Amino acid sequence: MELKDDDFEKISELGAGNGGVVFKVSHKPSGLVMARKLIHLEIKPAIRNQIIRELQVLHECNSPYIVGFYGAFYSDGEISICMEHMDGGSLDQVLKKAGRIPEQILGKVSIAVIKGLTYLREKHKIMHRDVKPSNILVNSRGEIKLCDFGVSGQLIDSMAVGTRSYMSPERLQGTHYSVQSDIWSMGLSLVEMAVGRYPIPPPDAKELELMFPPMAIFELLDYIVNEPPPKLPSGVFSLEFQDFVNKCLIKNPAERADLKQLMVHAFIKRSDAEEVDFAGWLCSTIGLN
Amino acid sequence: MELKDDDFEKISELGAGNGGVVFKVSHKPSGLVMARKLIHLEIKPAIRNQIIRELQVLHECNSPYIVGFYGAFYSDGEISICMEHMDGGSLDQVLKKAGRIPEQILGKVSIAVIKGLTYLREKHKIMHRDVKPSNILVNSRGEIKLCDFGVSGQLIDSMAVGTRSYMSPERLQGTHYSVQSDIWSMGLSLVEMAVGRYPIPPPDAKELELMFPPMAIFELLDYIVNEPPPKLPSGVFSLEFQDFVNKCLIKNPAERADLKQLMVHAFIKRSDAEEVDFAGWLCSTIGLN
Ligand SMILES: Nc1ncnc2c1ncn2[C@@H]1O[C@H](COP(=O)(O)OP(=O)(O)OP(=O)(O)O)[C@@H](O)[C@H]1O
Ligand SMILES: Nc1ncnc2c1ncn2[C@@H]1O[C@H](COP(=O)(O)OP(=O)(O)OP(=O)(O)O)[C@@H](O)[C@H]1O
Ligand SMILES: O=C(NOC[C@@H](O)CO)c1cc(Br)c(F)c(F)c1Nc1ccc(I)cc1F
Ligand SMILES: O=C(NOC[C@@H](O)CO)c1cc(Br)c(F)c(F)c1Nc1ccc(I)cc1F
Ligand SMILES: [Mg+2]
Ligand SMILES: [Mg+2]
Structure with a gap:
């Protein structure tokens, strides 16, 4: 399933550091609990598409010692990386x-x-x-x-x-x-x-x-x-x-x-x-x- | 006038750096255009009150070579400093x-x-x-x-x-x-x-x-x-x-x-x-x- 901004709901705040916070969230369509890191970047529309393209390799990063990946997307001002909630x-x-x-x-x-x-x-x-x-x-x-x-x-x-x-x-x-x-x-x-x-x-x-x-x-x-x-x-x-x-x-x-x-x-x-x-x-x- | 979170409306984004962005905003009650810096701080409720208390001295910082100050307050997760829009x-x-x-x-x-x-x-x-x-x-x-x-x-x-x-x-x-x-x-x-x-x-x-x-x-x-x-x-x-x-x-x-x-x-x-x-x-x- 393709992850999308409007299909989410903020549960709580998992933490923060040196930049944007990460929220405990609810992917409404699947009912799955996830962690959603937001990275604000004052960046041109061309290269931000390249960043999402390169972040698709996280789908192929399957391992018990690696945090799970669901998908990435550009909402409005900040890119989004969605992952397994630990x-x-x-x-x-x-x-x-x-x-x-x-x-x-x-x-x-x-x-x-x-x-x-x-x-x-x-x-x-x-x-x-x-x-x-x-x-x-x-x-x-x-x-x-x-x-x-x-x-x-x-x-x-x-x-x-x-x-x-x-x-x-x-x-x-x-x-x-x-x-x-x-x-x-x-x-x-x-x-x-x-x-x-x-x-x-x-x-x-x-x-x-x-x-x-x-x-x-x-x-x-x-x-x-x-x-x-x-x-x-x-x-x-x-x-x-x-x-x-x-x-x-x-x-x-x-x-x-x-x-x-x-x-x-x-x-x-x-x-x-x-x-x-x-x-x-x-x-x-x-x-x- | 005491500044308050619900009395604001985001116009645009003035910029960002090493932390929270600052928005061009509209203080609805006064109709005044301002700049609103948000500083997210994962901090106890006791000392965040001290920060707002110490930020009140910006009211007394009147000078043509100093950016104007309207007020500061704690909304929800992030403190707010409101200032003259340049x-x-x-x-x-x-x-x-x-x-x-x-x-x-x-x-x-x-x-x-x-x-x-x-x-x-x-x-x-x-x-x-x-x-x-x-x-x-x-x-x-x-x-x-x-x-x-x-x-x-x-x-x-x-x-x-x-x-x-x-x-x-x-x-x-x-x-x-x-x-x-x-x-x-x-x-x-x-x-x-x-x-x-x-x-x-x-x-x-x-x-x-x-x-x-x-x-x-x-x-x-x-x-x-x-x-x-x-x-x-x-x-x-x-x-x-x-x-x-x-x-x-x-x-x-x-x-x-x-x-x-x-x-x-x-x-x-x-x-x-x-x-x-x-x-x-x-x-x-x-x-x-
Ligand atoms: N998938 C996750 N599950 C649970 N908690 C998480 C997850 N991802 C991040 N966190 C929490 O959010 C906090 C912030 O993470 P983030 O990567 O934004 O900064 P950091 O790694 O803590 O510090 P720095 O900014 O210096 O790298 C972390 O301390 C962590 O506790
Ligand atoms: N009162 C203001 N009027 C107009 N623009 C502002 C105002 N305050 C901040 N800005 C803009 O917002 C940007 C971000 O300011 P901020 O203080 O958050 O970080 P910075 O000073 O740019 O960099 P750093 O985080 O390294 O200190 C600035 O580059 C500036 O252009
Ligand atoms: O988010 C990344 N690192 O954290 C630092 C920032 O939060 C600033 O504090 C991160 C960095 C790089 Br470089 C990268 F290429 C990424 F894809 C990052 N994110 C990331 C990578 C893998 C997984 I699993 C989850 C994630 F959120
Ligand atoms: O906002 C301050 N500095 O900017 C750095 C941060 O945005 C991180 O990137 C700032 C720092 C200190 Br220390 C302080 F005591 C303040 F009151 C700050 N804010 C501030 C001070 C004066 C005015 I006029 C406006 C303002 F937003
Ligand atoms: Mg981290
Ligand atoms: Mg600055």
């Missing part, structure tokens, strides 16, 4: 309510992210460009999926920040970056969710006793590229998980691990075997089922 | 249509910015925090006014970027900045409008013959703080204007000129005396009257 929300939201996320839970998350990035690269020959806690969605069925990836080249152009960067050192410095940049973003996201707050700058010795102002714009980005990367605090986290994020946060992208090597890492192998009721822990911390 | 639009828009802006015209602009910043500091003890071509509005009467300044401390907190920085070196590096940061922003804006494009990085010798890719995020901000500041190209611009922006773009904020010294600069003294029909040139380049 009742658990994004991982930045569940980190707020949970304080920290257990290492065991982040194991299952890492499996979902690696398999999602792997699907996009092999089947669709594209990178994510925006891996962070807010673009990793979860639901009550226990599913962990990825949204907001770069399928349309024209949309990447039309939207080219925020005071929290998950961008790799190489992407920050210039145009010499590609799929490895996503690995850095994943590693930094995992350190954030494990520790309870954004990892840069790193906590001093005295701050780590409590758990177990904000930086200026240039101050933050200078730390990422020049100062040594964020490690995970020893003792409370296992050696396998410590080495996993260490491999993900190697400044040099060619020296840094890729999806191939991380898939066969000791941390992922152990996490696959583990009996983890992710659906139960998710509903316990946010309160749903 | 039919000429912002200076970034008129720079696009004009290619370059004459030195003589930028003289009159500089007078408006200095007198607007001076009014805010002396009478209201506050700084702008966001001087750039988009926050300098003009109209058919020939008026040049300033909008989008920091009157509410709580609103500054709730909104704390874009790939074009007008932030001073000191503000980029840390918290050690104040009213002098506005001077840098003014200087960089004047170089942009004079030359036809964003001054960083500076044009090479061969690019300046034509007139008379984009940088990465860290690449841009590293140029601002470490590499020498942007000069104005000699020959086509006068020595007075060259020294004016040179004083505005001194990296060291204490060494850099303040509003006092710039008011008595040779460039401003000459620009005051000059017979410049700003209203005629404005309507000629954008097409209005």
Whole structure:
């Protein structure tokens, strides 16, 4: 079915960030509950047709680790991307309510992210460009999926920040970056969710006793590229998980691990075997089922 | 009169940037045409009342170099700031249509910015925090006014970027900045409008013959703080204007000129005396009257 503006009704507000909000909505003709992202773009009528055309590849992006797609269209001033509604929300939201996320839970998350990035690269020959806690969605069925990836080249152009960067050192410095940049973003996201707050700058010795102002714009980005990367605090986290994020946060992208090597890492192998009721822990911390 | 959501009607769209759009609107009860900025903020009901309370000082901000204020209120999801509609639009828009802006015209602009910043500091003890071509509005009467300044401390907190920085070196590096940061922003804006494009990085010798890719995020901000500041190209611009922006773009904020010294600069003294029909040139380049 072709999605259309007048066939929708606003239920509630799922959230917002650095632009247009996304609503919980009701596609009246199907009765299906969906999430509707609106991206306002002050753009000519020619290239906005190209954006919808390039967004049709999301129909062919079928995967359990990828957020579902129903269709895209231009209403009046803003393009629309309609997707599977994930009742658990994004991982930045569940980190707020949970304080920290257990290492065991982040194991299952890492499996979902690696398999999602792997699907996009092999089947669709594209990178994510925006891996962070807010673009990793979860639901009550226990599913962990990825949204907001770069399928349309024209949309990447039309939207080219925020005071929290998950961008790799190489992407920050210039145009010499590609799929490895996503690995850095994943590693930094995992350190954030494990520790309870954004990892840069790193906590001093005295701050780590409590758990177990904000930086200026240039101050933050200078730390990422020049100062040594964020490690995970020893003792409370296992050696396998410590080495996993260490491999993900190697400044040099060619020296840094890729999806191939991380898939066969000791941390992922152990996490696959583990009996983890992710659906139960998710509903316990946010309160749903 | 108290402004209210249901007493409004959308005429058209004046523009957008890094957030909510601003509409040309009709306040039905008064019949007055206004500009209505909507700032969506995912914020608690307690502190949003504080933001409206702090925005009431805009009523007392009466000045010919400051954009008029009618009132502010919380509708449903987004706060509203209602202001004088400036039919000429912002200076970034008129720079696009004009290619370059004459030195003589930028003289009159500089007078408006200095007198607007001076009014805010002396009478209201506050700084702008966001001087750039988009926050300098003009109209058919020939008026040049300033909008989008920091009157509410709580609103500054709730909104704390874009790939074009007008932030001073000191503000980029840390918290050690104040009213002098506005001077840098003014200087960089004047170089942009004079030359036809964003001054960083500076044009090479061969690019300046034509007139008379984009940088990465860290690449841009590293140029601002470490590499020498942007000069104005000699020959086509006068020595007075060259020294004016040179004083505005001194990296060291204490060494850099303040509003006092710039008011008595040779460039401003000459620009005051000059017979410049700003209203005629404005309507000629954008097409209005
Ligand atoms: N399909 C979805 N299901 C449930 N919630 C969603 C969905 N898509 C987005 N959201 C929620 O809406 C919020 C806003 O998403 P959006 O992509 O607009 O910005 P963001 O990713 O949060 O931050 P940024 O603008 O910095 O990328 C997210 O934090 C998320 O919680
Ligand atoms: N009072 C006004 N009268 C006429 N036009 C206006 C008025 N206020 C804003 N605009 C127009 O709306 C546009 C958007 O303004 P807004 O302050 O939302 O973002 P911006 O200043 O353009 O960019 P940024 O988001 O980077 O600060 C401006 O470019 C300007 O042309
Ligand atoms: O929406 C995208 N990213 O989020 C950032 C914006 O909300 C600004 O805050 C997005 C970006 C790019 Br580049 C792109 F090519 C897209 F198709 C995007 N949207 C998108 C992509 C995949 C899915 I499944 C859902 C979606 F909404
Ligand atoms: O609107 C303000 N600045 O623009 C940036 C946003 O649109 C995001 O793109 C603004 C910022 C601060 Br801090 C503040 F304290 C304000 F009151 C703002 N608004 C504002 C201030 C003065 C006037 I006259 C009009 C206005 F809309
Ligand atoms: Mg997102
Ligand atoms: Mg503005």
